[PDB]
């Protein structure tokens, strides 16, 4: 009587990865059945139907698209199998077709980035000119991080976004746009980079212009990646924020709750990360050791 969890993976932006889900199920004693939709909704819908046929206790999936799940979700509800959504939220026209959604909040990321700018410059004695390197036009995290950042700086009107342009989430995109900003904007105090790569690009443009990233022009970015954190530890970025994807254990814990009929909230929040330079300098070199210790304990499951 191990709980059986069917999980239909996609094949996106802040997505729980397979190793995390597989390892968390081993740790929780959950019998995990994986399916791969290969980017395609009809194949995810088939995987869900096959889990219903296999009589799993709980079905979770990471929706490849927001819409068009109501029919298959009626089939799960009719089979009495609870459903948990991960990573991407759905649009539904029905009531109570899934138990809970677990995923990252991109508006919150932008907001925390904005709020750090507001905090750091609460006493600025001159205007604070912010330039923004946006993600790919129309991408959900790009739209939301922009919305969030605007909210985070909204209580201090000395903070002004004086230029905002897509760098398409890439290093070369961020570098190219920052060059343009340096040409068009005589006074830049802060860059808000909606991901680490664009921030790293920007840092190189700032350096090529003979300026000092992190001191002359401060950089606040999203994504606590190795290279982002390395820049921050080197004092070339000033602040990083991240809203995590699903980690794994909370999914396993929720799966147990919903299989037992315990009511759960319709949304469960993921954890967050944030680092200034001092915090990155402590955390970064250590990560390899914490990772290795954890992998060692876990390998006894294999």
| Residues engaged in binding Zn ion (CB under 5 A) | 23, 26-27, 70, 93-94, 105, 108, 140, 144, 197, 243, 272, 276, 296-297, 299, 301-302
> Which of 143, 264 has the CB closer to Zn ion?
143
Quote the least distance from Cβ 207 to Zn ion, whole Å.
Answer: 19
Distance CA 116, CA 153 (A): 8
Contacts of 125 (CB under 8 A, 6+ apart): none
- Does 234 show up as a binding residue in the annotation? no
Closer residue to Zn ion, CB minimum distance, 212 or 226: 226
Instruction: List C-alpha distances in Å: 91 to 70, 94, 137, 268.
Output: 9, 9, 22, 17
Q: Six-digit token pair at 158?
A: 């000395």
Among 204, 235, 205, 233, smallest CA distance to 218 is for 235
Residue closer to Zn ion (CB basis): 183 or 299? 299
Does 87 belong to an annotated binding site?
no
Q: Select 99 or 145, whichever has its Cβ closest to Zn ion.
A: 145
| CA gap 69, 239 in Å, rounded | 39
Least Å from the CB of residue 210 to Zn ion: 27
Residue 302 marked ligand-binding: no
Distance (Å, rounded) from C-alpha 172 to C-alpha 16? 27
Residue keyed to tokens 């597989």 = 22
- Report which residue's Cβ sits closest to Zn ion: 243
Nearer CB in complex with Zn ion: 6/201:
201
How do the residues of the chain divide into helix, strand and coil, expressed in percent and rounded to 5?
A: 45, 20, 35
Minimum Å gap between C-beta 164 and Zn ion is 18
Binding residues are: 19, 26-27, 70, 94, 108, 140, 144, 196-197, 226-227, 242-243, 272-273
Binding residues for Zn(2+) are: 19, 26-27, 70, 94, 108, 140, 144, 196-197, 226-227, 242-243, 272-273
């Amino acid at each position: 009587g191990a709980l059986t969890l069917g999980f239909a993976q996609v094949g996106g932006w802040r997505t729980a990865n397979t190793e995390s889900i597989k390892s968390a199920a081993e740790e929780a004693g959950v019998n995990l059945k994986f399916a791969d939709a290969n980017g395609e909704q009809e194949k995810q819908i088939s995987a869900i139907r096959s889990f219903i046929q296999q009589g799993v206790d709980v079905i979770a999936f990471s929706p490849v698209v927001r819409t068009g799940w109501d029919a298959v979700l009626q089939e799960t509800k009719n089979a009495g199998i609870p459903v948990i959504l991960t990573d991407r939220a759905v649009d539904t026209q029905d009531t109570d077709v899934y138990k809970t959604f677990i995923g990252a909040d991109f508006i919150e990321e932008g907001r925390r980035a904005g709020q750090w700018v507001a905090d750091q410059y609460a006493s600025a004695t001159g205007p604070v000119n912010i330039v923004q390197l946006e993600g790919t036009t129309g991408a959900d995290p790009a739209i939301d991080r922009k919305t969030g950042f605007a909210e985070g700086i909204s209580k201090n009107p000395n903070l002004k976004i004086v230029a905002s342009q897509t760098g398409d989430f890439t290093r070369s995109g961020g570098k190219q746009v920052m060059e343009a900003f340096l040409k068009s904007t005589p006074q830049i105090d802060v860059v808000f980079a909606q991901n680490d790569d664009m921030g790293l690009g920007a840092m190189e443009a700032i350096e090529a212009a003979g300026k000092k990233p992190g001191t002359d022009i401060k950089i606040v970015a999203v994504d606590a990646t190795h290279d982002g954190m390395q820049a921050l530890a080197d004092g070339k970025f000033n602040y990083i924020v991240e809203c995590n994807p699903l980690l794994g254990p909370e999914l396993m814990d929720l799966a147990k709750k919903v299989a037992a009929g315990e009511p759960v909230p319709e949304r469960v929040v993921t954890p967050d990360e944030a680092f200034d330079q001092a915090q990155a300098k402590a955390a970064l070199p250590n990560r390899q050791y914490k990772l290795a210790a954890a992998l060692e304990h876990h390998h006894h499951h294999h």
